[PDB]
Design a protein around this ligand. Structure first.
Ligand SMILES: CC(C)C[C@H](N)C(=O)NS(=O)(=O)OC[C@H]1O[C@@H](n2cnc3c(N)ncnc32)[C@H](O)[C@@H]1O
Ligand SMILES: [Mg+2]
Ligand SMILES: [Zn+2]
Length: 860
RNA sequence: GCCCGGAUGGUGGAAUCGGUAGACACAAGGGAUUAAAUCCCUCGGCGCGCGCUGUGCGGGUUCAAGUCCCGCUCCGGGUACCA
């Protein structure tokens, strides 16, 4: 051991040891108890950023902690390798998506290995390889055969000039991010999976996930959006078809003063013939963006269609209006409006002079004031014919029954949850295994033809997909005749919905899963990934587990026991507009910045001379170009310092604004730990510790040692508050550095304490701890060393601290024996001069005593 | 807009079940060795071995509120084709 901590001469050395010994390679060992510690797998974007480092350090801490408790820990890594970013990058750099992606994988693989994360590299997966995607292809055809896949027309962002489809991200400030011309809605036929078929199972099973946080569970309930309501059908005067709507408020049905229909609705299209105002409005509606965000923030607009629907209970003619917020793809493409008791309908009817009829009494039984807003709260009906005086419940059922008996209403459960559209019109994805035959029929690709391989040796024009552009590729032969296979590819979430299961048997060729290996490792003990995925990915992931259960492939009903959603690591983001309207994101490293009195960024320019637009703190990613690569710091201070600093910055679940300030604190701390072990071990082998024999100074220190063990164990195992676990270990090191080390008993206690500090610090900083454990002459490699256990006898307290307050304000703090009574504490508190100061001339009215903790004398 | 979070010294954060506000660190200033590195001292505000005040803003509950309740501002995540 050298005097100086030299990370550069340790980490690479210890990393190689792990590779050669295959330390973190695991099999399905029936002797050991299993623990599956999964971190969400990275997209190979180029380099890691600190977001990645936070995810994979949290993973590694739990992986190493649980290994040290004696478990067989699976910690796998792989690459979610299909995606959009590879297409625009490959074009711009004059490559194809496949080689760009595999380069990134190698680069990042190397970064991950330099951070020292104990992965089972034997189980490494790439989702873009046909050894992987063939199985989801096979699976999709089984899903079709089971009736869980259908095709329908769906809205996509379409560039009419280029004839390309654009993702929501690629549409910016209305126009496209390439050049200046409008982006329009185009309904295009596409493949969906009936996730709504499992909506109730997905909804109900959230009540079983008591180790998933409520942030995630509540977000998921609200996303699925289960409601029990009524579908209602209206005849329309001079139109042969009917209009069907869905309401959850059939109690306010008598205050329905108009209906609102989509721009795509045939009734709107029929009326557009003779109504040029409406025809212009429908044509305008193609500019509406395919994104909920923009559709709720846009100004609510509409035109009268001229068609009058018959209200089935009053018989009154009510106008049908075409509106820009009602859409054909979702639901019936028509809704009913009750402006008196729906605020969105109130705003619409106010703007266009439509009738605002009241039908719900206020809580006191008064007719409501609808002069500033709608009465959204439920109540008794008035102005409702035979339904007057009925409360909410009875009104719901009465109107439902009457509408059912008339044969124009039916009760119905609805979900906000729409089905999962898996079609993408992009090159870099697994091809969808469906086929169109010469005779017009559509069916799954036959099993003998799976996988449908995506060619990698291609030339990209950026506009069209190589497999769509070349008409030879689609040609196959099925049932004896010519067929054309699908040129659309799968949504990239398809590969990330079952990777966790494939990790248990990645080289298995006979099927999707080896169910012996899958049932040994599943379900996942802890799943670690960003709060960004709370809804979309986690929901698909849970849905896909239920599909594989229904194929008899897995045992569990849910895929993951515990879920730890870390906060986002944020950074400042800047851009400038280019010479044809293209956003160009600049890194915060390359941006000269001038700040406010409050610390806010007020001016920003790049090194060249472009006035930058500052968008704010947002998540680190390659898209906004605001990601900080760890590679520079790792080579400066070492991986252990970078890791410790990340874990010490903030509790895992809280979102972090990244800053370089603080790294030295971790670097210095590790130098202090190194020093203390250097000095202790230079003095040689130590005597055995004599417990019953220690002085009161020695007894007190050993209490703090064993209390750190208990607290750190709880802080990692239960709370996952690693920052407080490190702070506890740091405080013990300051105690240990001030302790005497002369006597045989002092050196024996220092041994016990350092053996324990090094093990507690190992999950965080495993390289330095691997080395230090050998210097302290610990048994074996620290990776398999047992986790230290606190000793109840060493932790027993002889006194406790009581806080003394007068009318809630702290006036003194006293040490008192643990077994002390209220009367003794009062008498001891009275002896304090600052307590007596505020008891003079006043009476003690009330006393509050929290045992061993607090006394409040309520005085006046 | 809608759903979910968050805000504590110059800075990141601690306070685990409503009971000590600022643990543990960073930055800064001062001193000690001799520039680096190391080690001490000081460090929420306003006026002292004291007093008041102080956890984004406005109210309220309580013996006691960073914490609970009612109303807000700002900032982040998702909002179904970024992953
Ligand atoms: C399962 C599949 C859908 C995952 C998908 N392939 C994927 O997300 N890939 S990834 O490279 O972008 O990220 C990998 C992990 O790291 C987290 N993360 C990413 N950015 C940040 C950030 N700025 N801050 C904090 N965490 C971040 C992220 O949530 C994920 O758990
Ligand atoms: Mg602050
Ligand atoms: Zn365009």
């Amino acid at each position: 051991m050298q005097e100086q901590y030299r990370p550069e001469e340790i980490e690479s050395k210890v990393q190689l040891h792990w590779d050669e010994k295959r330390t973190f390679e695991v099999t399905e060992d029936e002797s050991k108890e299993k623990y599956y510690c999964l971190s969400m797998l990275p997209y190979p974007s180029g380099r890691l950023h600190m977001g990645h480092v936070r995810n994979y350090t949290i993973g590694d801490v739990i992986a190493r902690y649980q290994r040290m408790l004696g478990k067989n820990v699976l910690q796998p890594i792989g690459w979610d390798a299909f995606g959009l970013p590879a297409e625009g990058a490959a074009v711009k750099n004059n490559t194809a998506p496949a080689p760009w992606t595999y380069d990134n994988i190698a680069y990042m693989k190397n970064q991950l290995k330099m951070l020292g994360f104990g992965y089972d590299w034997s189980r490494e997966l790439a989702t873009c390889t046909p050894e992987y995607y063939r199985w989801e292809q096979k699976f999709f055809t089984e899903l079709y055969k089971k009736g869980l896949v259908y095709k329908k027309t769906s809205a996509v962002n379409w560039c009419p000039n280029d004839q390309t489809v654009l993702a929501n991200e690629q549409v910016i400030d209305g126009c496209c991010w390439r050049c200046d011309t409008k982006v329009e809605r185009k309904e295009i036929p596409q493949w969906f999976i009936k996730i709504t078929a499992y909506a109730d199972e997905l909804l109900n099973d959230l009540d079983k996930l008591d180790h998933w946080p409520d942030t995630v569970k509540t977000m998921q309930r609200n996303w699925i959006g289960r409601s029990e309501g009524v579908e209602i059908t209206f005849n329309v005067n001079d139109y042969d078809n009917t209009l069907t709507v869905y309401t959850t408020r059939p109690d306010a049905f008598m205050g329905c003063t108009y209906l609102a229909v989509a721009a795509g609705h045939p009734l709107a299209q029929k009326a557009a013939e003779n109504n040029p105002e409406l025809a212009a409005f429908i044509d305008e509606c193609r500019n509406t963006k395919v994104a909920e965000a923009e559709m709720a923030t846009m100004e609510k607009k509409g035109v009268d269609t001229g068609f009058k629907a018959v209200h089935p209970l009053t018989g009154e003619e009510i106008p049908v209006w075409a509106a820009n917020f009602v859409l054909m793809e979702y639901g019936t493409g028509a809704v009913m409006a009750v402006p008196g008791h729906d605020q969105r309908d109130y705003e619409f009817a106010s703007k266009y002079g439509l009738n605002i009829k009241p039908v719900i009494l206020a809580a006191d039984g008064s007719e409501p004031d609808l002069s500033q807003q709608a009465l959204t709260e439920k109540g008794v009906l008035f102005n409702s014919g035979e339904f007057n005086g009925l409360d909410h419940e009875a009104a719901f059922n009465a109107i439902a029954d009457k509408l059912t008996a008339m044969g124009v209403g039916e009760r119905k459960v609805n979900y906000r949850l729409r089905d999962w559209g898996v079609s993408r019109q992009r090159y870099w994805g697994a091809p969808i295994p469906m086929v169109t035959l010469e005779d017009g029929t559509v069916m799954p690709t036959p099993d003998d033809q799976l996988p449908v391989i995506l060619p990698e040796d291609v030339v990209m024009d950026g506009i069209t997909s190589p497999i769509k552009a070349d008409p030879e590729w689609a040609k196959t032969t099925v049932n004896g005749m010519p067929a054309l296979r699908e040129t659309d590819t799968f949504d990239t979430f398809m590969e990330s919905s079952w990777y966790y299961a494939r990790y248990t048997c990645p080289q298995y060729k006979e099927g999707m899963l080896d169910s012996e290996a899958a049932n040994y490792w599943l379900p996942v003990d802890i799943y670690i990934g960003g709060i960004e995925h709370a809804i979309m990915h986690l929901l698909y992931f849970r849905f896909f587990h239920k599909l594989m259960r229904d194929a008899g492939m897995v045992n569990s009903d849910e895929p993951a026991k515990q879920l730890l959603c870390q906060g986002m690591v944020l950074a400042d983001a800047f851009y400038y507009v280019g010479e044809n309207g293209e956003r160009n994101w600049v890194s915060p490293v390359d941006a000269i910045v001038e700040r406010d009195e409050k610390g806010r960024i007020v001016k920003a320019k790049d090194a060249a001379g472009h006035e930058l637009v500052y968008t704010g703190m947002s998540k680190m990613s390659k898209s906004k170009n605001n990601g900080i690569d760890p590679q520079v710091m790792v080579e400066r201070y070492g991986a252990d310092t970078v890791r410790l600093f990340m874990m010490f910055a903030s509790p895992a679940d809280m979102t972090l604004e990244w800053q370089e300030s603080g790294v030295e604190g971790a670097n210095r701390f590790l130098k202090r730990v190194w020093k203390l072990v250097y000095e202790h071990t230079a003095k040689g082998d130590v005597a055995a510790l004599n417990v019953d024999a220690l002085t009161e100074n020695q007894k007190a220190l050993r209490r703090d040692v064993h209390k750190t063990i208990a607290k750190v164990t709880d802080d990692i195992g239960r709370r996952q508050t690693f920052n407080t676990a490190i702070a506890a270990i740091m405080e013990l090191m300051n105690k240990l550095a001030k302790a005497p080390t002369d006597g045989e008993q002092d050196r024996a206690l220092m041994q016990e304490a350092l053996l324990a500090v090094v093990r507690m610090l190992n999950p965080f900083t495993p390289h330095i701890c691997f080395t230090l454990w050998q210097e302290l002459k610990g048994e074996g490699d620290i990776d398999n060393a047992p986790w230290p256990v606190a000793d109840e006898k060493a932790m027993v307290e002889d006194s406790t601290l009581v806080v003394v307050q007068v009318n809630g304000k702290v006036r003194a703090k006293i040490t008192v024996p643990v077994d002390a009574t209220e009367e003794q504490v009062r008498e001891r508190a009275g002896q304090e001069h600052l307590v007596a100061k505020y008891l003079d001339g006043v009476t003690v009215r009330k006393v509050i005593y929290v045992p061993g903790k607090l006394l409040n004398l309520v005085v006046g």
